[PDB]
Structures are given as structure tokens and as C-alpha cells.
Amino acid sequence: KKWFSEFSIMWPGQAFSLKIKKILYETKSKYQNVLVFESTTYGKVLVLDGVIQLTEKDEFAYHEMMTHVPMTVSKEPKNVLVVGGGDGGIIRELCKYKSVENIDICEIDETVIEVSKIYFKNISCGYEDKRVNVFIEDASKFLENVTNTYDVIIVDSSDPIGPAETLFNQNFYEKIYNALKPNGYCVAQCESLWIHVGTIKNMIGYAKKLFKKVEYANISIPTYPCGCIGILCCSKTDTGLTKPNKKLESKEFADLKYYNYENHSAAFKLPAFLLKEIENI
Amino acid sequence: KKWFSEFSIMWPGQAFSLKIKKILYETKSKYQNVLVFESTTYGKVLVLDGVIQLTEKDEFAYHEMMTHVPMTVSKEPKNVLVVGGGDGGIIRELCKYKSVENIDICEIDETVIEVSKIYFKNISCGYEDKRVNVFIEDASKFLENVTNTYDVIIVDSSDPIGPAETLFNQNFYEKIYNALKPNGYCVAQCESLWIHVGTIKNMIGYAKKLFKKVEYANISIPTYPCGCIGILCCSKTDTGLTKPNKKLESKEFADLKYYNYENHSAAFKLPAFLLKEIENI
Ligand SMILES: NCCCCCc1nc2ccccc2[nH]1
Ligand SMILES: NCCCCCc1nc2ccccc2[nH]1
DSSP states (O other): EEEEEOOOTTTEEEEEEEEEEEEEEEEESOOOOOEEEEEEEOEEEEEEETTEEEEEEEETHHHHHHHHHHHHHHHSOOEEEEOOOOTHHHHOOOTTTTTTTEEEEEESSSHHHHHHHOOOOOTGGGGSSSEEEEEEEEEHHOOOHHHHHHHEEEEEOOOOOGGGGSSSSHHHHHHHHEEEEEEEEEEEEOOOTOOHHHHHHHHHHHHHHHEEEEEEEEEEOOTTTEEEEEEEEESSSSSSSSSOOOOSSSGGGTTOSSOOOOHHTTTTTOOHHHHHOOOOO | OOOEEOOOOTTTTTTEEEEEEEEEEEESSSOOEEEEEEEEESSSEETTTTTTEETTTTTTHHHHHHHHHHHHHHOOEEEEEEEEEEEEEHHHHHTTTOOOOOOEEOSHHHHHHHHHHHOOOOTTGGGGGEEEEEEEHHHHHHHOOOSSOOEEEEOOOOSSSSGGGGGHHHHHHHHHHEEEEEEEEEEHHHHOOOTOOOHHHHHHHHHHHSEEEEEEEEETTTTSSEEEEEEEEEEESSSSSSOOOOOOOOOGTTTTSSOOHHHHHTTTTTOOOHHTTTTTT
């Protein structure tokens, strides 16, 4: 049996590998290389341009946190945008909120969505929900053209090497700002504090031009590089995203496996060296 | 340039690798294989029986948390035992406390200590401190024979495959209990919540026979398997180890890179699925 190994110039000198039980699908889409495999111990795995995007065993950590942080703080969110996220995980977590009326997703590569619907049915199950609308389209263009404004935007982007390159700059954060309601919130994937501190500092600077509160949270997830990944958290209000305004107590949330009320706030208590790096931004 | 790869039956189906800048020392001691290398990006690395024990880049996370959790809760700790920990990292963090009068360490393999003194000088620097006493000896035997009792015991053990096999059972926890002062505390390395939940549950059960409060905390550290490792936290008192009784404000603590007052408590807020697993223990 072979192993899959994840190498990258974004994490030089380190690699993470999973043993392959069997290869399920590979293709070269118009935008990237797509690989899907059953691992021996982490279930099925999705790989894009040789970087792991999710595994069945741990995906709930990243999807629950990315979704329920902003959604428990937004009072009455009605319209939510997901940028990237073709796998559907964020959407699955959003659909649990009865109050949400519309969910839009903007994903440039429809092959990601289709592969997720076929091979990852417990992740892509939200696509059946009537409130969900799909747009196959560059996120920049989508944000420039959309007429609606949103209560929450969740940027579930890949890394800056690839089609997600455009989602890590100042202009983008402007468009997000203009696309949010006046009390609206954006959370975005924002890399590992163990290795990408330069990026984290840049993203925070970009966000601080526009938003009045920019905060950063960390998630433990073994199949992203260095075992964690953070959330850049942007608020148009004094008060920010560190404290939930509700508890997820109805039956649709009984199955949550990571998120809870306490660990929402705990995710924002960061290692001392990171506080120091981002103190005078 | 070659890569080092960390395989194990304790984490089947996954491996983590670091690129080797150069090999510095290898030997077979009486107890295990010892390898030391300079990595391209994580500095120097110590390997025991093919498992990473520390790297210079991230060791502060595990050593600060393991030490300052119990030491900020113990009111006036005078005598502290470290079990295992031949590298010296815990000792380095202990020496920062002016109030401590004695530090004993019990490590079975003196080659670990000696290699750390030669190759890892910013880790093994506490061995120069006059309060430090070294015992080359099985921990079980040491605990059976010691006459003194301790304010804090820190069990910085390797994994259960190896000489640290004896440190993961009921009898051991008895001896620790008998070796502590009546208000004393023990913290112990207790594995990754992402993969070793059976072990975490067993260790907690063992501890709960004896101690009136057993709690579990998590540390983010990229070079241990799954990117995190936990602390089993044992208290003879109602009150436990989740809340510090002091702040580390004197000049000897200004250099801390992970631990702070807030993230002490935050480390005990665990993922929902782990709470559920250990609820009826
Ligand atoms: N190296 C960290 C990678 C994090 C990726 C998170 C993620 N997973 C995705 C799946 C489909 C589309 C966009 C995505 N963004
Ligand atoms: N797979 C997790 C390994 C954790 C090891 C922590 C550790 N590092 C050590 C260095 C010297 C002696 C005992 C040690 N215990």
C-alpha cells in the first residue's frame, strides 16, 4: 500500500503523510489537480493541487468553528455567503439554523462541488436544502456584482498558492466590507500560527483598514499543516466575535463534535509569542 | 538532503517528516536508540526510538505549559520532582521560580541528559542550577525509595512503547499520590485527543481512584503527532488546576513564549467529543 505525502513551499522542511487504502478519483480540472482517496485511518480525503483540503475524520473541527463562531454572535442572521468551500461542510453547519433564509456559495471550480456530492455525502448533504444557491464564479467578480448584502460571510479558501491567491489582499477585504450589512461579520481561513506569522500579520493589517474589530482564533485539526489553522474574525461593531450571544441547544445541534459555548471564547486565547507579534499592527 | 520520518504503531496510517540539514549524533544506549539532527526549519531535533521528543522551534510550548500550569496553582512550592524529562526543558522553566528550594529529576537513561547538555544548551541550561539533583534510575524504584514528599510532580514521559511503558498504569499513580504533599499536584504527559482517546480515558480512570480532582488540558505543538498533546492534571484538593493563583510577572518570566494567565484556563476547554467520551468515567 502506498502513502500520500503533502509537500509545499508554504511549509518548507516539513511534510505530513497518510496511508492510502485506495485511490477513488483523480482529474485535472480547469483550475487545479483533484485527488480523492480512502485513507487507512482518516477516512476519505480530498486533495487539491497536492494539499489536503479535508478528511472525514477531523473535518468537523474546522467546519463547526468557522460557522458557529460568527453564527452564534450574529443575532438574527438571514442571508449568509460562503466563499470557496465547494465541499459543502460550512453549508452543512449553516443549514442547522432555522432562522437562516438564504445561503449563497461562490466556488470557482464546480468539479470540487460535484466530487463532494458523489464521494463525501455526509459533507455535501446541505446542497439539498432549498435555501442554498450555488454560483460557479471567481469570488472577486461575485462580490463586485452581488446586489444583496449579507449578515455573515465565511471565507473557506484554500491557501494563497492557487486559485485562492486573489483572496489574501487588501482589495478583497474592501469588497467583503461593502458586501456586509452594517452590523455584519466576516470570518476567513487564516493559516497556522506555527509557520505563517508574516501572513497572519498582513491579513490583520488589511482587515484593520476597514473593520473596527479584527480578532484571531485557533482551531486544532491534525490534517492541516502544523496541526492547527486560524480564523481571521472581522467585525463592524465595537464588540467583536469572541463571545457568543446564544447557545446551540436545539435538536439540530445535538451532534456537534467540537464547538461548544466555552471553547468559542477559549479559541481566541492565543500563545504569548503571537500576541506579541500582532500587538502594534 | 534526506528526510526524517516518524512512523509508529501508536499512530497507524499517519507520519510526520522533517527535512535533515545534517545528522549530529546517533547511538544505541542501554535503553533506546538516540538520534540528534539539525532540521532545515525546526532547528535541532531529538529522536528516541524513532519518535520525536523535542525540537528547538516549538519545545517551549510543551515545557511552559507542563511547568507553569501546576506551578502557578501551587501556592509556595519548595520541592519539585520531574520524572523523565532528561532533556532539561521542564527544569529550565522550574528554575525561574526563586521560591523553589530543591528540584529532583529521575531519568533512567543518562545518555539523554548528556546529549542534551552537549547539543541543546538552551534547553539543558537548568542543570547548572545548584538546586537541581539528578538520579539515574527507574521512576518506579525512585518513587518507592524517596523519603521526601513533593509540592509538584511533573511526569515528562515518552510514549507507552519504550522505557516509559511502566508510567501508564494504576500502580504508578499510587506511588505518585503517596509521594505528594497532602495539598500537592501532579501533571503528566497524556497523549493526543485526536487519536489516543482510549488511553486518555484509562489514565483518567487510574487517576480518579486516588485523586479527588482529575482534569485534562491540551497544548498545541506541531512536532508531536496530530499537532497536540495533553496534560493529565491530578489534584488532592477540591479546587484543581484550571485557575492560576498568581501571575508570572517578575523578570525571569518576561521571555515566556506560550503560557500566559488566560491561556492557562483556556487549555482546559476541550472539544465537545472528548467531553462526551470522558463524562461517565
Ligand atoms: N493548508 C490549509 C488548507 C485549508 C483548506 C480549507 C479549505 N478546504 C476546502 C475545500 C474546498 C474548497 C475550498 C477549501 N478550503
Ligand atoms: N509522541 C509524543 C512524545 C512526547 C515526548 C515528551 C518527552 N520528551 C522527552 C525528552 C526526554 C525524556 C522524556 C521525554 N518525554
